[PDB]
């Protein structure tokens, strides 16, 4: 509808063994750090992961409807059925209806997961445009970070050379230095083919010459 307490910069990629996602942990109210160390991580099922950016209030609202989906039916309601391609579509419809009322939401979300053999990484926006691409970034990250990530992820053999975390780690440091509407801490989560893993509280690493050239504090 209109921003209140908001989150920015959710980065993601696909890799051989999985998809990798990273996001800072911040709830800013314009520029006042209301919450430091706040999650953005919704595990969906156990085999799919949603990273969400945008309004934080709206996020909470969406988490619950998702929650109802698996506590219903004879077997679990996100068990035998409901694949990530389905979960992506279901989400897109929900934005679409709001926009049609013109009483809108205000988030951009990445649904990431594994299907059963294939990586799933799909985008949804406040606009409501839906795509799958191997690389996604939100916010500030959408403008700045995504060409750095793109060099690696538009060259398909070079993807195959490594597990991605390092590109992610590196980008996020450049991002923290240039922008101070961002916070030093981040969380990074990896969805592998059978498993899901979250690495908790990290802080950006201090570069060599780059640390002299540019700092992250105001």
């Amino acid at each position: 509808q209109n921003p209140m307490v908001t989150g920015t910069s959710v980065l993601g990629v696909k890799f051989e063994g999985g998809v990798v996602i990273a996001a800072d942990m911040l709830g800013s109210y314009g520029s006042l750090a209301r919450f430091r160390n706040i999650s953005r991580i919704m595990r969906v099922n156990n085999s799919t992961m949603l990273g969400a950016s945008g309004d934080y209030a709206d996020f909470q609202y969406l988490k619950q409807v998702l929650g109802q989906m698996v506590i219903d039916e004879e077997l679990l309601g996100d068990g035998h059925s409901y694949s990530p391609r389905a979960i992506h579509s279901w989400l897109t419809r929900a934005m679409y209806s709001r926009r049609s009322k013109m009483n809108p939401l205000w988030n951009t979300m990445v649904i990431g997961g594994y299907a059963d053999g294939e990586s799933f990484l799909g985008y949804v926006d406040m606009l409501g445009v839906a795509y799958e691409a191997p690389s996604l970034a939100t916010g500030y990250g959408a403008y700045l970070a995504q060409p750095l990530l793109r060099e690696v992820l538009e060259k398909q053999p070079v993807l195959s050379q490594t597990e991605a975390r390092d590109l992610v780690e590196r980008c996020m440091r450049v991002l923290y230095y240039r922008d101070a509407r961002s916070y030093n801490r981040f969380q990074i989560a990896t969805v592998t083919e059978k498993g899901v893993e979250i690495e908790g509280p990290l802080s950006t690493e201090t570069n060599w010459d780059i640390a002299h050239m540019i700092s992250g504090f105001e």
């Binding site: 039916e73 059925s81 694949s83 391609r85 389905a86 579509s89 279901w90 419809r93």
Partner: protein, 233 residues
Amino acid sequence: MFRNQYDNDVTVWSPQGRIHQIEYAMEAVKQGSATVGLKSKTHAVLVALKRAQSELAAHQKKILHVDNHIGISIAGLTADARLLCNFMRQECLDSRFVFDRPLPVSRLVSLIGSKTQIPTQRYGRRPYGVGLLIAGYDDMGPHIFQTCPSANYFDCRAMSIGARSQSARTYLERHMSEFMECNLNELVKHGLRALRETLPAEQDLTTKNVSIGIVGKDLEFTIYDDDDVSPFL
């Protein structure tokens, strides 16, 4: 007595606690046509008899294409059946729009059931008096269900509706083991034989009444109609 009493209450309960309405409904299923259902569980076939009221007519269909992976045979009156069929097609359409998934036929069947059951549980609704053999080719294979107007939902590996259902059942149990998880051809022969058991058996086999409908691993909904069954005879 009190036959009229038991019609007048759709909320009926008797000393023996029976509900006559269901009873009436069962007699109406037996009044219908002859249909068998069979599955190997990698192919499923149904021989269905389509009959005609008189000489100068031509047979009315009782095999309905509900979907391009699911289907039915009807056994009981044509008029009610049409009404149910629209609801189920639209339920398939939103599954496709919203979810883009076929959806388990098992899950579907169960949902339809409730919505009927609840109006028997209150004033109004007469029985619908059509029984169905519902087939479909889903994710875990084909599956077969019997829907009754008693909303009695059962999955069976083969079943039958029509007067002298039991006859054909006993043959299905006997041949049951022979069905295995192969051969198209064999399932149909047994069906043609079986179907003979359902009829009074004074009526000789005919190619204009019979109709053969298959769905299977790479198959969807196909009907063999009239003469077209002769190739596979």
